[PDB]
Design a protein around this ligand. Structure first.
Ligand SMILES: [Zn+2]
Ligand SMILES: [Zn+2]
Ligand SMILES: [Zn+2]
Ligand SMILES: [Zn+2]
Lengths: 216, 219
């Protein structure tokens, strides 16, 4: 029955800056023993949640002192001192007073850093895939910032939008950059009908797009 | 040290029963700790499911009605989760953890195990090498990759050179289409390491008990 609220995202924080994450409960979490039962977790992409703080302000074993918790009974805050690239992820609070031990919706920490142009690489279908009657052309756009980016596919000079699937990674824990994969899937017959395949990337870091291509 | 590890089928048909196991090593589950199950839905919402403590005491989330059951096998130091009459809404990543009375779990969390509730069939992936067409900027870096296409359900694990090659690796989230997932992984290394040194992507798909090792060879 207890509902906990948290902001989806935080303003981008620069490495070195400190930030406070908020969490509010619909009911007091202070117990008759004087202790407040609130937990703070950090979860990185593909990683299991990691406990940072329990009992509202007690740091868990091995947890960096840069992490501290405070609050009343309905409003809690997690302060992260001198933020580092490694702290990127989603922060969740969990009330541990009454069942069910509901979790907050999580607040994603977004790191801010210098703009970076993507490294673009284009790959023709492999001979193995062509034997299947399918043909995927792949383009990697790695290590760029900000996350906003546009990719265009051109076959023999003409833009192709159908059959394109993109995938973005979460913010990197080491350099705070983003990466994206774009795949243009065609039938082998169609792939065999054209010669020039081009991947064009348009990013904030430049007026002119980054072009990568190959001839079949 | 104390470790928890979840195991169980990654795909279950709707209306059927879901059974998972958490094997605990380094600590006895006959203790008075809340050996609990928590799940995370696509979208990242977390939900506490229930726990078993002191071998015979349990507590479940009311939202799970009467379809959840948590039990244990003391002799094997394992505790279990059984969820009946599943629907696509039970698709999630299931985690086991050890909570103490104060809410402290320490680092006692499993790695999580993905469970998909779907009528679709299990399909192993086809793994294709991604090698550069020609010769890009020399004396610098070169990006290679592997395309893991047409599998179901999630997930697949991808490593390079059996794990000895981890830096400069980007494995992208899979994209679903026609009940089949496709994912890609890129790896960037010095133009001096490849093709001089062998670079191989290792792909595993637990659901189909399949493993593929694709060496990346020059065009
Ligand atoms: Zn990276
Ligand atoms: Zn055509
Ligand atoms: Zn041990
Ligand atoms: Zn037994």
């Amino acid at each position: 029955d207890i509902v906990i609220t948290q902001d989806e995202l935080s303003n981008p924080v620069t490495s070195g800056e400190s930030v406070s994450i908020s969490c509010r409960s619909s009911r007091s979490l202070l117990y008759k023993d004087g202790r407040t039962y609130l937990n703070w977790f950090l979860q990185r992409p593909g990683q299991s949640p990691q406990l940072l703080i329990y009992l509202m302000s007690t740091r868990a074993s091995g947890v960096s002192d840069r992490f501290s918790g405070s609050g009343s009974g309905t409003d809690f805050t997690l302060e992260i001192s001198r933020v580092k690239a490694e702290d990127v992820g989603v922060y969740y609070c969990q009330q541990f007073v009454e069942y069910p031990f509901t979790f907050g919706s999580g607040t994603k920490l977004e790191i801010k850093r210098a703009d970076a142009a993507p490294t673009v690489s284009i790959f023709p279908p492999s001979s193995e895939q062509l034997t299947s009657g399918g043909a995927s052309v792949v383009c990697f756009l790695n290590n760029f910032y900000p996350k906003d980016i546009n990719v265009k596919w051109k076959i023999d000079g003409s833009e192709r939008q159908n059959g394109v699937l993109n995938s973005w990674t979460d913010q990197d824990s080491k350099d705070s950059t983003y990466s994206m994969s774009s795949t243009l899937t065609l039938t082998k017959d169609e792939y065999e009908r054209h010669n020039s395949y081009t991947c064009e990337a348009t990013h904030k870091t430049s007026t002119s797009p980054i072009v990568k291509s190959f001839n079949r | 040290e104390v470790k928890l590890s979840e195991s169980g089928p990654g795909l279950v048909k709707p209306s059927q029963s879901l059974s998972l196991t958490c094997t605990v090593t380094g600590y006895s589950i006959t203790t008075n700790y809340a050996w609990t199950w928590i799940r995370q839905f696509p979208g990242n919402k977390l939900e506490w499911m229930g726990y078993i403590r002191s071998s015979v005491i349990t507590r479940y989330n009311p939202s799970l009605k009467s379809r959840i059951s948590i039990t244990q096998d003391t002799s094997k130091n394992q505790f279990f989760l059984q969820l009946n009459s599943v629907t696509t809404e039970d698709t999630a990543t299931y985690y086991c953890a050890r909570y103490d009375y104060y809410g402290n779990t320490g680092d006692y969390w499993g790695q999580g195990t993905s469970v998909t509730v779907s009528s679709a069939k299990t399909t192993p992936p086809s793994v294709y090498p991604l090698a550069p067409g020609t010769a890009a900027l020399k004396s610098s870096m070169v990006t290679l990759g592997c395309l893991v296409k047409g599998y179901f359900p999630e997930p697949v694990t991808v490593t390079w050179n059996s794990g000895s090659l981890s830096s400069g690796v980007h494995t992208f989230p899979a994209v679903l289409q026609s009940d089949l997932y496709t994912l890609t992984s890129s790896v960037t290394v010095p133009s001096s390491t490849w093709p001089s040194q062998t670079v191989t992507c290792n792909v595993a798909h637990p659901a189909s008990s399949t493993k593929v090792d694709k060496k990346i060879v020059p065009r």
